[PDB]
Amino acid sequence: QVQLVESGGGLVQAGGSLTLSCVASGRPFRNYRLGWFRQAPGKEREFVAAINWGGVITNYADSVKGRFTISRDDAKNTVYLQMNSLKPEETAVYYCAAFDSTGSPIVRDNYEYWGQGTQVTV
Amino acid sequence: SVTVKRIIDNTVIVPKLPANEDPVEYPADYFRKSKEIPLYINTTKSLSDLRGYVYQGLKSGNVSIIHVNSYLYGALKDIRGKLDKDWSSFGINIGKAGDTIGIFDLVSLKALDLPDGVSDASRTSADDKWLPLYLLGLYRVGRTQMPEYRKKLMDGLTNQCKMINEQFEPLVPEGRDIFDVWGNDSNYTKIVAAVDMFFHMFKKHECASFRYGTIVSRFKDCAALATFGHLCKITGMSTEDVTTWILNREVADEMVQMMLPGQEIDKADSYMPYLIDFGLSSKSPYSSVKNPAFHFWGQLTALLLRSTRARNARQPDDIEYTSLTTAGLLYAYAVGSSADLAQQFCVGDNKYTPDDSTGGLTTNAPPQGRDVVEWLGWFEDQNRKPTPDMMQYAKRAVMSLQGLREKTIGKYAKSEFDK
Amino acid sequence: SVTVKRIIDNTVIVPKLPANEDPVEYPADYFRKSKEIPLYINTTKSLSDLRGYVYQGLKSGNVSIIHVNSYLYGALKDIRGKLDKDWSSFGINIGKAGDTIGIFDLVSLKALDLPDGVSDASRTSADDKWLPLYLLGLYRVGRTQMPEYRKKLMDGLTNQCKMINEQFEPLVPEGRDIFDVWGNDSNYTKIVAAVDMFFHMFKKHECASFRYGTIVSRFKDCAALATFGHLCKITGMSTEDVTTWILNREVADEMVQMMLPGQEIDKADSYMPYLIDFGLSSKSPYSSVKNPAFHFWGQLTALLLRSTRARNARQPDDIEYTSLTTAGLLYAYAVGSSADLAQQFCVGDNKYTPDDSTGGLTTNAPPQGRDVVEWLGWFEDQNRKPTPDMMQYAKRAVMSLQGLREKTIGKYAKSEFDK
Amino acid sequence: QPDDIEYTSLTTAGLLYAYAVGSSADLAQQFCVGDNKYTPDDSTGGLTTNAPP
């Protein structure tokens, strides 16, 4: 098993930057995909960004390309994600997810582990 | 390097030969740079997609090694075992406490940065059972170019027939060339080495049969070490005693080369036996290519001491066959004459009491034990020429050998002493 | 472990070899954890359903081992015997007083937690008679890969033809691969072992013929022990006397390994002979794989003492053939020369009276009995080298041997002494 | 085998060389245990002459 803790959320000014982090506990010494999701008020959980295990392959949703950046330090077993140029459309609860393999899916049914999530209001 | 002159005109000459580096890479010199070995793999496509990818790819001549790696991952990802005791190797504590360890805890997962391929349905999870066993077996099958020894595909076919009765090889006969390339993908070798290393610790796993095909990865390119074990077993002497019976300078340098003190060559479960497929070393230090005189000497001595494995051991190139053979003759003759039979169990607390009142001076007789210090002296009393009883002994050992292959030390010894 | 240095530069070397655990599991170490062995079986479907299940499954290539286990249960469940005396083994009192004991009293019944299969009618209770005998016989048939020795299926076919004249094997020729997998189901082996263990106690049961096919389960993977019995029979010496004639350190360690004092190896009817199929042990302590030097030594000595079984006993790998062979030569020569003929019955109360007035000092002659303490001394008087009468004796024993298989101690001894 | 060379003298030279290397194995102890090495005996004075080097 693996536990994920999201940290770094809050409110920010319309147009401001922010960087969420997700800390993994349990078994970090094994293949596990890392992706960020979000869910807005009355909106189904959608994909935001993902990163493979090695830390070379990544992908972003169209709504956030250019702005957001994803990264991971598996030594400290975490995964940061810069969120520059925020917008009130960016307001949602952001979840950190893991699915054990060697890649990063674009769906929410590909993951196996989920955090509790952090609120982000803009 | 000493000065040499031509005596007819005092002209100085510099005899020099072409040089070849061919350095040696030890496993522990890899881990002081990187504290982990990566496995490059693609985790994009799904498992049931890869099943038809490599099944329909196997049925034809086209298949992507990236797809059999990415399929072998998720096809072997949920396999586990419980450690009785801790497991650490070269500063890598793979297993902590009582926590279970999987087959890919040994390596670190990285992302490969694609092959279009072709898919297939109707392929259930009943093929996830043996398709890894198959793909792993073809690594062992595809390393030998002999036509009938490559018929280990019949034993992979059989071992999978045990899993599912109606299993027949999903590869064309031309397939004898399909899996020969798989051994060149570093990640596939990093898979088979992790499978064998895992199933060596967890020995009675229900999926331990998977070790078939990966067992050729253990101590790959490490023959000379196995000849040291075979000699220390056939002679019956300790490693330190056999180490003294080395009388050749080359075998001395090679024996110093193999026995460097920080390579975990004595640990039961370690990363050392898989230093080639894991990529810990590109030129093994324990091969019969970097230790030729040791391979020839130990294998020949074993053969003279009634060995069976040595009958087909291959004779290396560019070594001192004469000095090495004489050394093996004195060693094998010493071990042969000195059976060293000694009473082990007694009944009425009566043991063999040797008689010391034998004073007729039975000199000019070979030594009584297996000490090198005495057999070198007796051999000096023989003017450093093998006695006719030694040559006759070797003839007795090598005669009645039949079905000998060319370029083997069996045919060499037979052609040397049997006349 | 003693310090070894290279004399050219005082450099310290550490000669070390790869290590292999391969531990040994004794049967009595299994029963101190669990006081009973379970048999996992499925009791859902009915008997007459399983009869067609395994008959129609047998006629084709598809059959479920779960169905032949579940069928063998109810097909053998109502078989019994009356104990003359109590029966207990490893703290398990299987039989109490005069009460009858069935074939599954030995194990405990658990539930297996399914194969869809296919059914058949018109199959009466006249097939319950021999279908167990068949399915049990295929366990013995399906353990040998030799083409003509696997034709014990003709003797199972015959033994069932005795039960019903019109019995012909309900298995396709490809079936040579069908029952080879049955030996991998732990519960099937726990069935055959219970059948053989039961029919060993109840010897003249009307269904004792069922033991055919299960007899290969008794002392399976326990060859070295049988070589100790064969040596103690061929030599004619007691077990304690033969135990003294062990002159090799390896045979000493192995002989100590087999004779651990709490494994019921001497009980007539015990759980010990079936420690492999019952799952009491995964690595037998009495096999010729963990006792190689004992197998080679005892088998070779027997062969030199006019044995017939040893002519085909196989020669293990990685042992001291030289020292072991010399030991077997001195032992077999001692037993051969010392016939120890002694008068047994007399008529007029006249016995052979030996003459003690022989004082010409007939020294330099071999000892008179079979005591090790004297033959080691005489052998020392022979400079620990076999005399030409010993080598000639061995040549006399191994010559005129014909039809010898390769890798057998018969061809080994013949190739060693016959020249 | 090349053409137009002195097969006789060359063969005799190779015979003396190969015989020298063949007879003189030059076996020498390399590793010791209790710091005991082979000590050659110099008290051999029966004059074993007419023997190869």
Report the distance separating Cα B388 and Cα B394, nearest Å. Answer: 10
Report the distance separating Cα B16 and Cα B221, nearest Å. Answer: 31
> In this structure, which long-range contacts are made by residues C227-232, counting pairs with CB atoms below 8 Å and at least 24 apart in sequence?
C227/C288, C227/C294, C227/C295, C227/C298, C227/C299, C227/C302, C227/C313, C228/C255, C228/C258, C228/C294, C228/C298, C230/C298, C230/C299, C230/C302, C230/C307, C230/C309, C230/C310, C231/C298, C231/C301, C231/C302
> By 3-state DSSP, what share of chain A in percent is helix, strand and coil, each rounded to 5?
5, 45, 50
CB contact under 8 A, C380 and B267: no
3-state secondary structure of B50: helix
What pairing do the DSSP bridges indicate for beta strands A2-7 and A19-26? antiparallel
Question: D34 at the B interface (CB within 8 A)?
Answer: no
Asked whether C77 and C102 are in contact (CB, 8 A), the reply is: yes
Nearest CA-CA partner of B150 in B138, B167, B159: B138
The number of beta carbons lying within 10 Å of the beta carbon of residue B18 is: 4
Among the partner residues A27, A30, A102, nearest to B111 by beta-carbon distance: A102
Q: Which residues contact D24 (CB under 8 A, 6 or more apart)?
A: B384, D52, D53
Rg (CA), chain A: 13
Chains D and C touch (3+ CB pairs under 8 A): yes
| Torsion angle of the four alpha carbons C217, C221, C225, C226, in this order, in degrees rounded to the nearest 10 | 60
3-state secondary structure of C111: strand
Chains C and A touch (3+ CB pairs under 8 A): no
Task: Quickly list H helices, B205-283.
Answer: 223-234, 239-244, 249-258
Among the partner residues B252, B322, B377, nearest to D38 by beta-carbon distance: B377
Asked whether C202 and C81 are in contact (CB, 8 A), the reply is: yes
CB contact under 8 A, B268 and C180: no
**Which DSSP symbol is given to C404?**
P
Residue C17 has phi, psi (to 5 degrees) of -120, 155
- DSSP readout, B118-154? ----S--TTSTTTHHHHHHHHHHHTT---TTTTTTHH
Report the distance separating Cα B217 and Cα B221, nearest Å. Answer: 9
Beta strands, E only, chain D: 31-32
Asked whether C109 and C187 are in contact (CB, 8 A), the reply is: no
Please, what is the angle between helix B131-141 and helix B65-76, to 10°? 130
What pairing do the DSSP bridges indicate for beta strands A92-99 and A113-114? antiparallel
Q: Which residues of B touch A55 (CB under 8 A)?
A: 110-111
What pairing do the DSSP bridges indicate for beta strands A81-83 and A58-60? unpaired
- DSSP readout, B82-117? B-SS-EEETTEEEE-TT-B--TTSSSEEEE------
Residue B408 has phi, psi (to 5 degrees) of -110, 150
Report the distance separating Cα C416 and Cα B169, nearest Å. Answer: 45
The pair of structure tokens assigned to C191 is 């069935």
Whole-angstrom CA distances from C260 to C24, C75, C253 are 12, 38, 11
**Which DSSP symbol is given to D50?**
S
Rg (CA), chain B: 27
Strand order in the sheet with A81-83: A2-7, A19-26, A81-83, A68-70
Tally the residues of chain D.
53
Nearest CA-CA partner of A101 in A37, A1, A34: A34
Residue B88 has phi, psi (to 5 degrees) of -145, 150
**Which DSSP symbol is given to C98?**
T
CB contact under 8 A, B373 and D36: yes
What pairing do the DSSP bridges indicate for beta strands C108-111 and C92-95? unpaired
Interface contacts B/D by beta carbons within 8 Å: 54
Asked whether C105 and C94 are in contact (CB, 8 A), the reply is: yes
Report the distance separating Cα C53 and Cα C301, nearest Å. Answer: 52
HEC readout, C31-92: HCCCCCCEEEECCCCCHHHHHHHHHHHHHCCCCCHHHHHHHHHHHHCCCCCECCCCEEECCE
Q: Which residues of B touch D41 (CB under 8 A)?
A: 377, 380
Tally the residues of chain A.
122
Report the distance separating Cα B74 and Cα B43, nearest Å. Answer: 9
Disruptive mutation site among B254, B321, B376 for chain D (greatest number of D CBs within 10 Å): B376
Q: What angle do CA C363, B366, B295 make, to 5 degrees?
A: 135
Report the distance separating Cα B417 and Cα B397, nearest Å. Answer: 9
The pair of structure tokens assigned to A117 is 């999530």
Touching partners of C (3+ C-beta pairs < 8 Å): B, D
What pairing do the DSSP bridges indicate for beta strands C38-41 and A10-11? unpaired
**CA end-to-end distance (rounded Å), chain C:** 41
CB contact under 8 A, C8 and D30: yes
Asked whether A19 and A81 are in contact (CB, 8 A), the reply is: yes
**CA end-to-end distance (rounded Å), chain A:** 34
Burial class (CB in 10 A: 0-12, 13-18, 19+), C35: exposed
CB contact under 8 A, D38 and B323: no
Nearest CA-CA partner of C302 in C195, C397, C400, C396: C397
3-state secondary structure of C413: helix
Residue C10 has phi, psi (to 5 degrees) of 60, 15
CB contact under 8 A, C2 and D31: no
Report the distance separating Cα B228 and Cα B295, nearest Å. Answer: 8
Asked whether B159 and B134 are in contact (CB, 8 A), the reply is: no
Q: Which residues of B touch A33 (CB under 8 A)?
A: 43
Residue C146 has phi, psi (to 5 degrees) of -75, 135
Rg (CA), chain C: 27
Among the partner residues B204, B308, B400, nearest to C317 by beta-carbon distance: B308
Nearest CA-CA partner of C278 in C225, C218, C224: C218
CB contact under 8 A, D31 and C4: yes
The number of beta carbons lying within 10 Å of the beta carbon of residue C296 is: 28
Asked whether A26 and A1 are in contact (CB, 8 A), the reply is: yes
Report the distance separating Cα C40 and Cα D7, nearest Å. Answer: 84
3-state secondary structure of B249: helix
Asked whether C286 and C258 are in contact (CB, 8 A), the reply is: yes
Whole-angstrom CA distances from C376 to C198, C326, C383, D32 are 47, 12, 10, 31
The pair of structure tokens assigned to B20 is 């070849």
**Which DSSP symbol is given to C149?**
T
The pair of structure tokens assigned to C186 is 């732990």
Residue B356 has phi, psi (to 5 degrees) of -100, 0
Report the distance separating Cα C76 and Cα C416, nearest Å. Answer: 52
Among the partner residues B70, B77, B111, nearest to A54 by beta-carbon distance: B111
The angstrom resolution of this structure is 5.5
Q: Which residues of D touch B372 (CB under 8 A)?
A: 29, 38
3-state secondary structure of A81: strand
Q: Which residue has the tokens 């209770």?
A: C125
Report the distance separating Cα A36 and Cα A9, nearest Å. Answer: 13
Question: D46 at the B interface (CB within 8 A)?
Answer: no
Half-sphere exposure of C69 (CA within 13 A, CB side): 27
Whole-angstrom CA distances from C345 to B303, C348, C349 are 53, 10, 9
Instruction: Please count the helices (runs of H) and the strands (runs of E) in chain D.
Output: 1, 1
3-state secondary structure of C3: coil
Asked whether C50 and C71 are in contact (CB, 8 A), the reply is: yes
Burial class (CB in 10 A: 0-12, 13-18, 19+), C387: middle
> Residue A36 forms beta bridges with which residues?
A49, A96
Question: C341 at the D interface (CB within 8 A)?
Answer: no
